[PDB]
Amino acid sequence: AEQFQLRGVLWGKAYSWKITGTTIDKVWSIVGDYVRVDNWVSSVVKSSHVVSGEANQTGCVRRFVCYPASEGESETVDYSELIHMNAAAHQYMYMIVGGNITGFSLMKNYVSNISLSSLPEEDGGGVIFYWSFTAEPASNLTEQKCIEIVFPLYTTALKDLCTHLSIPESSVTLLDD
Amino acid sequence: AEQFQLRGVLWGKAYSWKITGTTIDKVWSIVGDYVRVDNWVSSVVKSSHVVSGEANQTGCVRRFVCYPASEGESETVDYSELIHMNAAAHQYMYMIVGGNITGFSLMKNYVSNISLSSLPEEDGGGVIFYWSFTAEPASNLTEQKCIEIVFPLYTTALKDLCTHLSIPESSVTLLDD
Ligand SMILES: O=Cc1ccc(O)cc1
Ligand SMILES: O=Cc1ccc(O)cc1
Ligand SMILES: O=Cc1ccc(O)cc1
Ligand SMILES: O=Cc1ccc(O)cc1
Ligand SMILES: O=Cc1ccc(O)cc1
Ligand SMILES: O=Cc1ccc(O)cc1
Q1: Best CA proximity match to A114, nearest among A37, A50, A45, A22
Q2: Cα–Cα 20 to 30 A to A27, which of A81, A116, A172, B44?
């Protein structure tokens, strides 16, 4: 029992938002439909389908297609595997297992976590949206560059969430901003 | 760019608590002092110190010793590595890399995440304490057993945190997931 094995360290960051004027169920209807992320981050994602396993069950793989970055550029594609799903607890975990999404496909073993929590009713309710990622250090990136890839997308997704919820963007507050 | 590599799924769960009556900095002074977890979960941990790397810097390993879990039994020991740290953002990640801590040492690649967030000053303040874990599925365990091992420890740790902060136990509220 007096021995240990060193492991590599990770890059990453976790973010949390408070969302008012909605419920965990309404947010989850959009955010929790993992294989239909095209119905969530619709400003970036053109379409999305399950390509392995059963839709939204642990182990399944989604393939989604992103709109071109500019006129002459091609659409890009993501493959990501649901590696944990707990719908009852409004939380899941996924990782990129293929594709060529700009920035994201550069990272080594990008793994992301989403968790929704309800604030107590007597405090006016609202939802805490937790979203984190990690990636393994590799020579072609830095942690800072990973954060510069991830955080603007998370930000866009929170804005797209509001659009689908028909609530104002001001409904969302990034905690510790 | 149209193929993917399937991976195994994970076990785990994420929990969030609201903590009132304190500040994120006070909480962090206890929770974020990774190598002195004996100053936090004092009802379980007898002693703790860094045994590899620089204290509370990513890559470091702490060794801590726990009191006999029940009478008759012997002390147990944990070795865990800090695999991510962002002190200014009040979040870190660690994993067990050795030892024989009851329950926790049975899991394969136990990885845990702690993240503190401030609720808006505007809406009354308070701290959100996020704590999650994953483990790799293994034949000698079940995910249910993992949760039965982990959750009571997290719960005890939040109680001990209140003791050290000199705030009532009523300060902590587990959020509905
Ligand atoms: O399935 C949700 C989940 C999220 C974060 C974790 O750390 C573990 C599980
Ligand atoms: O966090 C995963 C993710 C990455 C890129 C997207 O377009 C959508 C989700
Ligand atoms: O807005 C405060 C509030 C108090 C008690 C409730 O049940 C709901 C809201
Ligand atoms: O989350 C890991 C952990 C386990 C036992 C402890 O006593 C403290 C932390
Ligand atoms: O008994 C083994 C041992 C190793 C490192 C320590 O810091 C303490 C004990
Ligand atoms: O628990 C989160 C986690 C992140 C990256 C991994 O490689 C494994 C687990």
Answers
A1: A37
A2: A81
Residue A3 has what DSSP assignment?
-
Quote the Cα angle for A159-A161-A165, to 5°.
120
- Tokens at residue A23, please? 């419920």
Q: CA A31 to CA A19: how far, in whole Å? A: 13
Contacts of B97 in chain A (CB under 8 A): 4-7
- The closest of A62, A20, A50, A12 to A158, measured between CA atoms, is A20
Tell me, which fold does domain B1-177 have in CATH?
Alpha-D-Glucose-1,6-Bisphosphate; Chain A, domain 4 (3.30.530)
Which residue out of A65, A100, A130, A174 would a mutagenesis test of the B interface target, given it has the greatest number of B Cβ atoms within 10 Å? Answer: A130
Q: Which of A37, A153, A161 to mutate to test the pocket of ligand 2 (most atoms within 8 A of CB)?
A: A153
In three-state secondary structure terms, B158 is helix
Name the H helices within chain B: 24-31, 143-165
User: Please, which residues bridge with residue B18 across strands?
Assistant: B128, B173
Tokens 């800090």 correspond to B82
- Experimental method used, please? X-ray
Going by the DSSP 8-state scheme, the letter that residue A120 receives in this structure is P
